[PDB]
Amino acid sequence: NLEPVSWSSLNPKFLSGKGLVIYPKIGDKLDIICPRAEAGRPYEYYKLYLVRPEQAAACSTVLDPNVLVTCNRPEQEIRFTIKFQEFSPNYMGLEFKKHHDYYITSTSNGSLEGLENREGGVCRTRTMKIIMKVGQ
Amino acid sequence: NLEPVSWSSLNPKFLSGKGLVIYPKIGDKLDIICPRAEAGRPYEYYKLYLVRPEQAAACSTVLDPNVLVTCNRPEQEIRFTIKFQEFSPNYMGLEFKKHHDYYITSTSNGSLEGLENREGGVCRTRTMKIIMKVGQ
Amino acid sequence: NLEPVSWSSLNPKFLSGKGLVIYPKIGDKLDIICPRAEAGRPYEYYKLYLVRPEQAAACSTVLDPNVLVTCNRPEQEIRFTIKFQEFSPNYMGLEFKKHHDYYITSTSNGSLEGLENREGGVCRTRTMKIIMKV
Amino acid sequence: GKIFCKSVSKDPDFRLKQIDYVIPVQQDRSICMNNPLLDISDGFFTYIHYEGINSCKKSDSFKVLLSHGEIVDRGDYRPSLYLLSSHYHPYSMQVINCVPVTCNQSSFVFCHISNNTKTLDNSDYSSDEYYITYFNGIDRPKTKKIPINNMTADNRYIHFTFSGGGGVCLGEEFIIPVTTVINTDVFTHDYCESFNCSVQTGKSLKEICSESLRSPTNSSRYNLNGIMIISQNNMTDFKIQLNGITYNKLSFGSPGRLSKTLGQVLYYQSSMSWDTYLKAGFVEKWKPFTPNWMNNTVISRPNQGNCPRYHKCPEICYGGTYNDIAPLDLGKDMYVSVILDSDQLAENPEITVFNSTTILYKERVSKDELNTRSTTTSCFLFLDEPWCISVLETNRFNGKSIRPEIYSYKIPKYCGTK
Amino acid sequence: TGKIFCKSVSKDPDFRLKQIDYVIPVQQDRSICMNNPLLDISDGFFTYIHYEGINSCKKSDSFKVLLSHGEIVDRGDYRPSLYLLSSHYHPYSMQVINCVPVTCNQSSFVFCHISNNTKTLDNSDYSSDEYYITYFNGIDRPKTKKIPINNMTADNRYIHFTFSGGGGVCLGEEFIIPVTTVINTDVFTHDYCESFNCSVQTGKSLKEICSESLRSPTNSSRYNLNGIMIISQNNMTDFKIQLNGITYNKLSFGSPGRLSKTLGQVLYYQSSMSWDTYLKAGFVEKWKPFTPNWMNNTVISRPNQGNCPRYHKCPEICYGGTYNDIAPLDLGKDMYVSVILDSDQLAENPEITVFNSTTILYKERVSKDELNTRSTTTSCFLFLDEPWCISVLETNRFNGKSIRPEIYSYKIPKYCGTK
Ligand SMILES: *[C@@H]1O[C@H](CO)[C@@H](O[C@@H]2O[C@H](CO)[C@@H](O[C@@H]3O[C@H](CO)[C@@H](O)[C@H](O)[C@@H]3O)[C@H](O)[C@H]2NC(C)=O)[C@H](O)[C@H]1NC(C)=O
Ligand SMILES: *[C@@H]1O[C@H](CO)[C@@H](O[C@@H]2O[C@H](CO)[C@@H](O[C@@H]3O[C@H](CO)[C@@H](O)[C@H](O)[C@@H]3O)[C@H](O)[C@H]2NC(C)=O)[C@H](O)[C@H]1NC(C)=O
Ligand SMILES: *[C@@H]1O[C@H](CO)[C@@H](O[C@@H]2O[C@H](CO)[C@@H](O[C@@H]3O[C@H](CO)[C@@H](O)[C@H](O)[C@@H]3O)[C@H](O)[C@H]2NC(C)=O)[C@H](O)[C@H]1NC(C)=O
Ligand SMILES: *[C@@H]1O[C@H](CO)[C@@H](O[C@@H]2O[C@H](CO)[C@@H](O[C@@H]3O[C@H](CO)[C@@H](O)[C@H](O)[C@@H]3O)[C@H](O)[C@H]2NC(C)=O)[C@H](O)[C@H]1NC(C)=O
Ligand SMILES: *[C@@H]1O[C@H](CO)[C@@H](O[C@@H]2O[C@H](CO)[C@@H](O)[C@H](O)[C@H]2NC(C)=O)[C@H](O)[C@H]1NC(C)=O
Ligand SMILES: *[C@@H]1O[C@H](CO)[C@@H](O[C@@H]2O[C@H](CO)[C@@H](O)[C@H](O)[C@H]2NC(C)=O)[C@H](O)[C@H]1NC(C)=O
Ligand SMILES: *[C@@H]1O[C@H](CO)[C@@H](O[C@@H]2O[C@H](CO)[C@@H](O)[C@H](O)[C@H]2NC(C)=O)[C@H](O)[C@H]1NC(C)=O
Ligand SMILES: *[C@@H]1O[C@H](CO)[C@@H](O)[C@H](O)[C@H]1NC(C)=O
Ligand SMILES: *[C@@H]1O[C@H](CO)[C@@H](O)[C@H](O)[C@H]1NC(C)=O
Ligand SMILES: *[C@@H]1O[C@H](CO)[C@@H](O)[C@H](O)[C@H]1NC(C)=O
Ligand SMILES: *[C@@H]1O[C@H](CO)[C@@H](O)[C@H](O)[C@H]1NC(C)=O
Ligand SMILES: *[C@@H]1O[C@H](CO)[C@@H](O)[C@H](O)[C@H]1NC(C)=O
Ligand SMILES: *[C@@H]1O[C@H](CO)[C@@H](O)[C@H](O)[C@H]1NC(C)=O
Ligand SMILES: *[C@@H]1O[C@H](CO)[C@@H](O)[C@H](O)[C@H]1NC(C)=O
Ligand SMILES: *[C@@H]1O[C@H](CO)[C@@H](O)[C@H](O)[C@H]1NC(C)=O
Ligand SMILES: *[C@@H]1O[C@H](CO)[C@@H](O)[C@H](O)[C@H]1NC(C)=O
Incomplete structure (x- = not known):
């Protein structure tokens, strides 16, 4: 198991320049909790894309990136468990293997108006990118 | 598996006169989720007691009833899973058997000020009592 | 003390090319257990030789190499404790010292028919050699 | 009997x-054998799987194995798979998908071949080829x-x-499961639109349900299940018909x-959406x-994202696992299937005999945690007793080569025997 | 030496x-529950204890307490076998509150607490009760x-x-038995608990939370503190009894x-029935x-319902848990084995787990089916120059029928990854 990663603009683990880097070994669990209804009622709506390093640097996604998980419900604690095995129940396989890099980001504006905005968004404003170099 | 029971004053399953009755068979799972921070910020703090039917009628507990679970944190999803096996990891054994009765209540005032109020409380005001006749 | 080395053809520590290397410091204990009667009754019979690197590569022994320990009995767990001191109760001294090389192998066929086979054997088939640069 | x-x-x-x-054992550790398929009929089976280099994606495969075989009694009081013939698909490097059918004690493989691995997103069927091997x-x-x-x-x-995981032979007609692509919303959704779930604030349920049928990589295309009926005069004068579900x-x-x-024809559809x-x-x-359609309230499948196990409400979701079922008793509405006992991860396969409303009994395949991406199950009468054979797309050795596993088991004669 | x-x-x-x-005997009566098993192995001999009750699996609610003495024997099976030698029922079983086994000098010793009051720990004192050695x-x-x-x-x-506890220890002529004491004043400090950086409950302070978490859950005025009892004697003569706190x-x-x-060492285990x-x-x-x-184990826990489930870390007034013995395998590698329960809150799915202080090395489920288990004990020993272990599980596979613990024997794998 690993420390779950709460996906909100109010999380310190997202380094202002490097994002959140993780070095998970194969067979590790990792939750990605998207936040519940926060106390101050700041509704947080995102849409996460499994992406490639080049467009993770450029912070742009075309139609081919698959919507890995979307933070639809504000009340329900929506979550996303990951085991770094090879086989995954996701569309497009998503083989993890070992000694690879895996980048997860969101291009969305904070609210639901830009939910499917794929041009810019949080990837560069807050640099909320999860980078997972397995191994080492 | 069985339907989890959200424990809040905003839960319909608590009938105004009959409480919440369940007829579980042995070997069933049953979660008792105490609520997250609700949207409207109505902080709900309770303290649940495993009690006897006689003390369930008066809605009062002496010191011998064991505080089964307390709903301390508003943000964290505090929970309580039950399997109706005989052996249970709780203090005082808590044998389930079959063809028995098991009553769960809270005597607490809605907020933390009367969290440990054991005289009356929700057991009679809102009749939030869970009664479990195993079998049938 | 060190981690004992079970001496059987069913041991992974014997790398397929490099054998089993150990870097012990002076004054450490190290057991070399020859196996008990295995479950499937595959009797394992060996004869271990304290050897020099040159004939350890060729996996051959003449009469002068000393039979360090022999795995005669299948049921009894015969063993071999080592302390890397200078003095040892063995014939031919066997001084350990420091910054030396010490090679132990067996040229034996798996069973008792080739117990004293000194020509080839496990030293080259399975590369079951213990090499110890202290 | 029963x-x-x-x-x-x-x-x-x-x-x-x-x-x-x-199943053969490949000498190369980097090769991944993935997406197994198995279809049994009249004592003969057809097994298919894909082989790829450092990738377990189906069309990303350089070899596609096609095996034909027979069920044989070895005096073991249980069925054995006897491999008779084994060939590689002549167009393996261009295979997008294949489906096995064992017809008249012989093997038939229906494959879609294309130069473009993304043909389903930007092309049409006139640009591709389709074969029967x-x-x-x-x-x-x-x-x-x-x-x-x-x-x-x-x-x-x-x-x-x-x-799909298998097809059917009826007379001179082959009936193969097929997934079609169409670029206009010609569909209705009374079932999806009837659910009384929280309406997401962006769109309404009619929009949610229309868009949930779209391809996730071509917002303009829709994926609709169906069948293909191929009748012929001894590989002559083919007559092909394509009907939607x-x-x-x-x-x-x-x-x-x-x-x-x-005596029946069972259709199964993997649940890769919100239901x-x-x-x-x-x-x-x-x-x-x-x-x-069944009203099964106990059999589901794991998936990451907004639609995990036991999820019911309509939502724009994509993902899931393929888990065949096999009927055991028509009157008692009993079925068996190797399902994954996890909410979001694809692991812990369990042989499960179930009702439409209750799970009857189950057993884990392995005591240790086991990765399994898909399962298929086929059951049949052997020595007047019900036996089943399942194939699991396993990954027990993480980091090493992937190869599916075959299991044979019997429906218990008596209840609670251990 | 060799490992x-x-x-x-x-x-x-x-x-x-x-x-x-x-x-373990098989009772003909389906209504009798055999619960809370104990097993202690020493020098090739063991002492087994369990409680028998009528329509209730509570320890002090028991009418019979079985005491078994036996030996470890080789049957040519390439594995150790349990040979039951003697089996007796405790003469004061219906008044037994607790017992602890010790196998000393190839013999069985049972240290029991007998009381007229099943709630003696809440409203009485030890002068009102009796304590025996059988x-x-x-x-x-x-x-x-x-x-x-x-x-x-x-x-x-x-x-x-x-x-x-699940066992005691013989050192020369001295017996060392695990004991839980009761004291009615707060004489304790809690620097370890007070150092945790967790969310502060809005009701009480962290120093109060940590002081009060040591209280008995059924007498708010009493505190339960673990300790040992050292009993030295001249061949059951001139007893010298000492009570030391943890x-x-x-x-x-x-x-x-x-x-x-x-x-060559003495290992103490304490079941985690509080917040840690x-x-x-x-x-x-x-x-x-x-x-x-104290170990710094970050991977071994136990299930429990309530505010302290598996892997719960933060200080909290919690009570409940399961007893799960451990047994050391290698001192230098800090390796241990234990039958733990693979569930966050329910007591089920026992798994033999060989673990580090920081990582779990390997594990295997005991049963393929879901199995109810309230507590486990494990003891390991050398047999045929090989490490073998015997565990007893407080099982409930037959719900509604009779309850009976189970004994398992297993060997630590010689080589890694063999199946
Ligand atoms: C998403 O899927 C739709 C559905 O097929 C795709 O629609 C088709 O897209 C092509 C080009 O992407 C269009 O081009 C056509 O090409 C021929 C050849 O020059 C020309 O004769 C036509 O007049 C037209 O230019 C095509 O019209 C269009 N629709 C159909 C019915 O074929 C769409 O391209 C896909 N988009 C992506 C990004 O994958
Ligand atoms: C498969 O689904 C059917 C419904 O289509 C289930 O039907 C009925 O379920 C009940 C509850 O388990 C069965 O037992 C009942 O037990 C009480 C005990 O006294 C008895 O009084 C009732 O009359 C009833 O027998 C019931 O047997 C079963 N229906 C039939 C015709 O047997 C069925 O339970 C599901 N499968 C299984 C294995 O439960
Ligand atoms: C909770 O635990 C406390 C501490 O043990 C209990 O308080 C003390 O109990 C003793 C019982 O031996 C009381 O002393 C005796 O009372 C009898 C009554 O007749 C008297 O005859 C004896 O000479 C002796 O005084 C003692 O007074 C009492 N408290 C104090 C402060 O000394 C308490 O009873 C327990 N409560 C529950 C509900 O379990
Ligand atoms: C049991 O606990 C010990 C500590 O008490 C662990 O120690 C060390 O753990 C690492 C990680 O598994 C072992 O591998 C090493 O990792 C580093 C990472 O950079 C790598 O560079 C090294 O080449 C090496 O592979 C390391 O050998 C181990 N050392 C010792 C003395 O134990 C240990 O990992 C735990 N047990 C197991 C089986 O991991
Ligand atoms: C995030 O993106 C959304 C995209 O819809 C923004 O919403 C639009 O903002 C433009 C300003 O350029 C307005 O003219 C539009 O009326 C807005 N709505 C729509 C539907 O286009 C939003 O302002 C962005 N920033 C946030 C949400 O903080
Ligand atoms: C020389 O032999 C030693 C024998 O142990 C090798 O040491 C181990 O090698 C394995 C695999 O190569 C590593 O996983 C271990 O980490 C090594 N041991 C330690 C303590 O790190 C060693 O690698 C060989 N080669 C060299 C250059 O030392
Ligand atoms: C668990 O952690 C504690 C706290 O660090 C260890 O106790 C310390 O042990 C070290 C030895 O490495 C001593 O130098 C310190 O003096 C100890 N702490 C104090 C406060 O004195 C304990 O040894 C650890 N358990 C192990 C290593 O098994
Ligand atoms: C509950 O009891 C406390 C006890 O003083 C009281 O202060 C409070 O007003 C009561 N009602 C609540 C907390 O709603
Ligand atoms: C090993 O040597 C013996 C010597 O007699 C021979 O009989 C045997 O065939 C050889 N090979 C084995 C035992 O595999
Ligand atoms: C398969 O068998 C049936 C038997 O009725 C026959 O009608 C059909 O033509 C056969 N398929 C062939 C010959 O391809
Ligand atoms: C949803 O609608 C159906 C049909 O109108 C109804 O039977 C069902 O009870 C409804 N759901 C709820 C939760 O009321
Ligand atoms: C093909 O289609 C034509 C016209 O649609 C029809 O006349 C013919 O029978 C069909 N089949 C074959 C084999 O040509
Ligand atoms: C569909 O399944 C549900 C599950 O219990 C059931 O209540 C409902 O009656 C079923 N519908 C029909 C038409 O049987
Ligand atoms: C109290 O316990 C002792 C235990 O030996 C017993 O002898 C005595 O009879 C008991 N007292 C009563 C009143 O039963
Ligand atoms: C147990 O062994 C020790 C060993 O010295 C001995 O002194 C003692 O008398 C023996 N018997 C008992 C009951 O302790
Ligand atoms: C110890 O006391 C017992 C009492 O039964 C007696 O039989 C024995 O002779 C005494 N001495 C030794 C050494 O055990």
Whole structure:
């Protein structure tokens, strides 16, 4: 198991320049909790894309990136468990293997108006990118 | 598996006169989720007691009833899973058997000020009592 | 003390090319257990030789190499404790010292028919050699 | 006959045994053998799997194995898979999908071949090719091109692929599960629109349900399940028809299955959208292709994202696992299936004998945690007793090569025997 | 000296697990519940204890307490076998509150607390109760001697105590038995608990939370503190009894413990029945005060319902948990084995787990089906120059029918990844 990663603009683990880097070994669990209804009622709506390093640097996604998980419900604690095995129940396989890099980001504006905005968004404003170099 | 029971004053399953009755068979799972921070910020703090039917009628507990679970944190999803096996990891054994009765209540005032109020409380005001006749 | 080395053809520590290397410091204990009667009754019979690197590569022994320990009995767990001191109760001294090389192998066929086979054997088939640069 | 455990019980003795001599063992550790398929009929089977280099994606495969074999009694009181013939697909490097059918004690493989691995997102079926590869235990395999030009369709389909874990032979007609692509919303969704779930603030349920049928990589395309009926005069004068599945209880296009079992035709559809419960049913009519959908409240499948196990409410979701079922008793509505006992991860396969409303009994395959991406199951009568064979797309050795596993087991004669 | 076995992270271990059924008796009455098993192995002999009750599996609610003496024997099976030698029922079983087994000098010794009051720990004192030693060997009739608690010396102002644990220890002529004491004043400090950086409950402060978490859950005025009892004697003559408390460093609510002689050391285990849900265990440094070198285990926990489920870390007024013995395998590699429950809140799915202080090395489920298990105990020993272990599980596979614990024998895998 690993420390779950709460996906909100109010999380310190997202380094202002490097994002959140993780070095998970194969067979590790990792939750990605998207936040519940926060106390101050700041509704947080995102849409996460499994992406490639080049467009993770450029912070742009075309139609081919698959919507890995979307933070639809504000009340329900929506979550996303990951085991770094090879086989995954996701569309497009998503083989993890070992000694690879895996980048997860969101291009969305904070609210639901830009939910499917794929041009810019949080990837560069807050640099909320999860980078997972397995191994080492 | 069985339907989890959200424990809040905003839960319909608590009938105004009959409480919440369940007829579980042995070997069933049953979660008792105490609520997250609700949207409207109505902080709900309770303290649940495993009690006897006689003390369930008066809605009062002496010191011998064991505080089964307390709903301390508003943000964290505090929970309580039950399997109706005989052996249970709780203090005082808590044998389930079959063809028995098991009553769960809270005597607490809605907020933390009367969290440990054991005289009356929700057991009679809102009749939030869970009664479990195993079998049938 | 060190981690004992079970001496059987069913041991992974014997790398397929490099054998089993150990870097012990002076004054450490190290057991070399020859196996008990295995479950499937595959009797394992060996004869271990304290050897020099040159004939350890060729996996051959003449009469002068000393039979360090022999795995005669299948049921009894015969063993071999080592302390890397200078003095040892063995014939031919066997001084350990420091910054030396010490090679132990067996040229034996798996069973008792080739117990004293000194020509080839496990030293080259399975590369079951213990090499110890202290 | 029908003398077996039909009640809720614990500790079942399936007499589970693994079969290792059927599926070949590749010498290269980097090769991944993935997406296994198995179809059994009249004592003969057809097994198919894909081989790729450092990648387990189906069309990303340089070899596609096609095996034909027979069920044989070895005096073991249990069925054994006897491999008779084994060939590689002549167009393996271009295979997008294949479906096995064992017809008349012979093997038939229906494959979709294309130069473009993304053909389903940007092309049409006139740009691709479709083949039937057929062989048995003695005859050399022969491959015939399907004349899609001479195909008749019940709707304006723009693309299609054979997608599923198996097909069916009825007389001179082959019935293969297929997933079609169409670029206009010609569908209705009374079943999805009738759910009383929280309405998401962006769109309404009619929009949610229309868009949930879209391809996730082409917002302009829709994936609709269906069947293909191919009749012919001894590989002559092919007559091909493409019919869509009923609009009652529509679910996003996904690999399916047709199986001949117990005098019936069973259709299965993997749940890759928001309705995470078992989509299966026996075939009532053929036009439109109407399976009598079950109300299964206990069988689901794991998936990451917004639609995990036991999820019911409509939502724009994509993902899931393929888990065949096999009927055991028509009157008691009993079925068996190797499902994954996890909410979001694909692991812990469990042989599960179930009702439409209750799980009857189950058993874990391995005591240790086991990765399993998909399972298929087929059951049959052997020595007047019900036996089943399942294939699991396993990854027990993480980091090393992937190879599926075959298990054989018996429905328990008596309840609670251990 | 010699230790050949798997000492690395691996999957699919071959423990060669086998269940033993001929040792524990099978009661003809389906209504009788046999619960809370105890097993202690020493020098090739064992002492087994379990409770028998009518329509209730509570420990003090028991009308029979079985005491079994036996031996470890080789049957040519390449594995150790349990040979049951003697089997007797405790003469005061219906008044037994707790018992602890010790196998000393190839014989069985049972240290029991007898009381007229099933709630003696909540409203009474140890002067009102009696404590006995029942001792025997093969076929010899059992003899029971009353412990002279009047001539007992204590290191603090304790008001009550019970022998609570899965085993004791014999050192020369001294017995060391795990005990849970009761005292009615807060004499404790909690630097370890007070150092945690967790969310502060809005009701009480962290110092109060940590002070109050040591209280008994049924007498708000009493505190339960773990400790040991050292009984030295001249061949059951001139008893000398000493009561020492556990170190106040990393205090946890009073709970059943264990002392075991393993690898030339003495290992103490304490079940985690409070907020620190991780493994409490350690080797004994000093005897006065009883100071075990507490482990820093980050991977071994136990299930429980309520506010302290599996892997719960933050201080909280919690009560509940399961007893799950551990047994050390290698001192240098800090390796241990234990039958733990693979569930966050329910007591089910036991798994034999060989683990580090920081990582789990390998594991295997005991049963393929879901299995109810309230507590496990494990003891390991050398057999044929190989490490073997025997575990007893407080099982409930047959719900509604009779309850009976189960004994399993298994070997630590010689090589890694063999199945
Ligand atoms: C498969 O689904 C059917 C419904 O289509 C289930 O039907 C009925 O379920 C009940 C509850 O388990 C069965 O037992 C009942 O037990 C009480 C005990 O006294 C008895 O009084 C009732 O009359 C009833 O027998 C019931 O047997 C079963 N229906 C039939 C015709 O047997 C069925 O339970 C599901 N499968 C299993 C194995 O439960
Ligand atoms: C998403 O899927 C739709 C559905 O097929 C795709 O629609 C088709 O897209 C192509 C080009 O992307 C269009 O081009 C056509 O090309 C021929 C050849 O030059 C020309 O004769 C036509 O007049 C037209 O230019 C095509 O019209 C269009 N629709 C159909 C019915 O074919 C779409 O391209 C896909 N988009 C992505 C990004 O994958
Ligand atoms: C049991 O606990 C010990 C500590 O008490 C662990 O120690 C060390 O753990 C690492 C990680 O598994 C072992 O591998 C090493 O990792 C580093 C990472 O950079 C790598 O560079 C090294 O080449 C090496 O592979 C390391 O050997 C180990 N050392 C010792 C003395 O134990 C240990 O990992 C735990 N047990 C297992 C089986 O991991
Ligand atoms: C909770 O635990 C406390 C501490 O043990 C209990 O308080 C004390 O109990 C003793 C019982 O031996 C009381 O002393 C005796 O009372 C009898 C009554 O007749 C008298 O005859 C004796 O001479 C002796 O005084 C003692 O007074 C009492 N409290 C104090 C402060 O000394 C308490 O009873 C327990 N409560 C529950 C509900 O379990
Ligand atoms: C995030 O993106 C959304 C995209 O819809 C923004 O919403 C639009 O903002 C433009 C300003 O350029 C307005 O003219 C539009 O009326 C807005 N709505 C729509 C539907 O386009 C939003 O302002 C962005 N920033 C946030 C949400 O903080
Ligand atoms: C020389 O032999 C030693 C024998 O142990 C090798 O040491 C181990 O090698 C394995 C695999 O190569 C590593 O996983 C271990 O980490 C090594 N040991 C330690 C303590 O790190 C060694 O690698 C060989 N080669 C060299 C250059 O030392
Ligand atoms: C668990 O952690 C504690 C706290 O660090 C260890 O106790 C310390 O042990 C070290 C030895 O490495 C001593 O130098 C310190 O003096 C100890 N702490 C104090 C406060 O004195 C304990 O040894 C650890 N358990 C192990 C290593 O098994
Ligand atoms: C509950 O009891 C406390 C006890 O003082 C009281 O202050 C409070 O007003 C009561 N009602 C609540 C907390 O709603
Ligand atoms: C090993 O040597 C013996 C010598 O007699 C021979 O008989 C045997 O065939 C050889 N090979 C084995 C035992 O595999
Ligand atoms: C193909 O279609 C034509 C016209 O649609 C029809 O006449 C013919 O029978 C069909 N089949 C073949 C094999 O040509
Ligand atoms: C398969 O067998 C049936 C038997 O009725 C026959 O009608 C059909 O033509 C056969 N398929 C062939 C020969 O391809
Ligand atoms: C949803 O609608 C159906 C049909 O109108 C009804 O039977 C069902 O009870 C409804 N759901 C709820 C939760 O009321
Ligand atoms: C569909 O399944 C549910 C599950 O209990 C059931 O209540 C409902 O009656 C079923 N519908 C029909 C038409 O049987
Ligand atoms: C109290 O316990 C002792 C235990 O030996 C017993 O002898 C005595 O009779 C008991 N007292 C009563 C009143 O039963
Ligand atoms: C146990 O063994 C020790 C060893 O010295 C001995 O002194 C003692 O008398 C023996 N018997 C008992 C009952 O302790
Ligand atoms: C110890 O006391 C017992 C009492 O039964 C006696 O039989 C024995 O002779 C005494 N001495 C030794 C050494 O055990």
